[PDB]
Amino acid sequence: TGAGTPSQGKKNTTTHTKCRRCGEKSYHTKKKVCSSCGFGKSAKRRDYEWQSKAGE
Amino acid sequence: TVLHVQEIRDMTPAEREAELDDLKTELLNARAVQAAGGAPENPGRIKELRKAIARIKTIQGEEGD
C-alpha cells in the first residue's frame, strides 16, 4: 500500500475547525487547542517574532 | 417623517408605549405583506417605521420612560 494516493482515501477525520476565539479554521477539535491563536492553550494571544523578518 | 420628535416628547409614558405597539404592528404587517411578496407596498414607510421606533425608544430612555 503506497504512502501516496491510496493512503489519501483513508482521510475522513475532522481535526482543525473554526475557532471560537479567532475565527480561523485552526481549532483542533481533538486537542481543543487553536494552532493559530492559542485558544485553549493560553489566555494571551499566540504570537511570535519569527512571524516576520527580524528587522521588521 | 409623519411622526416628529416634539409629538413624541409630548406623549405621556403610557402613550409612547401604546404608540410603540402600534408602530410594531404596522411593521410586522409590512414584513408580512413583504413575505407574501405583496406589491401594495411603499418602501419608504417600512424604513420609516424602524426609525420611528428607534426615536420612541430613544425618548423613553431620555425621559426615564
Binding site: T14, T17, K18, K25 | -
Partner: protein, 46 residues
C-alpha cells in the same frame, strides 16, 4: 456527519453568500461575485 446549530448557521451563511451580484448593481455601476463557491470544486472551513 452531524451538524450543530452553530455549524448550521455558518453553512447557511455560506449558502446565502454564494449568490449572483444583483442585475441592478450592474447598471448602477455601469459594469461578478469573486466569492462564488461550488460544493464539489471547493471546500468550506471546519
Amino acid at each position: 456527519g452531524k451538524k450543530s446549530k452553530a455549524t448550521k448557521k455558518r453553512l447557511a451563511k455560506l449558502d446565502n453568500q454564494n449568490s449572483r451580484v444583483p442585475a441592478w448593481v450592474m447598471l448602477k455601476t455601469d459594469r461578478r461575485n469573486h466569492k462564488r463557491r461550488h460544493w464539489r470544486r471547493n471546500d468550506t472551513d471546519e
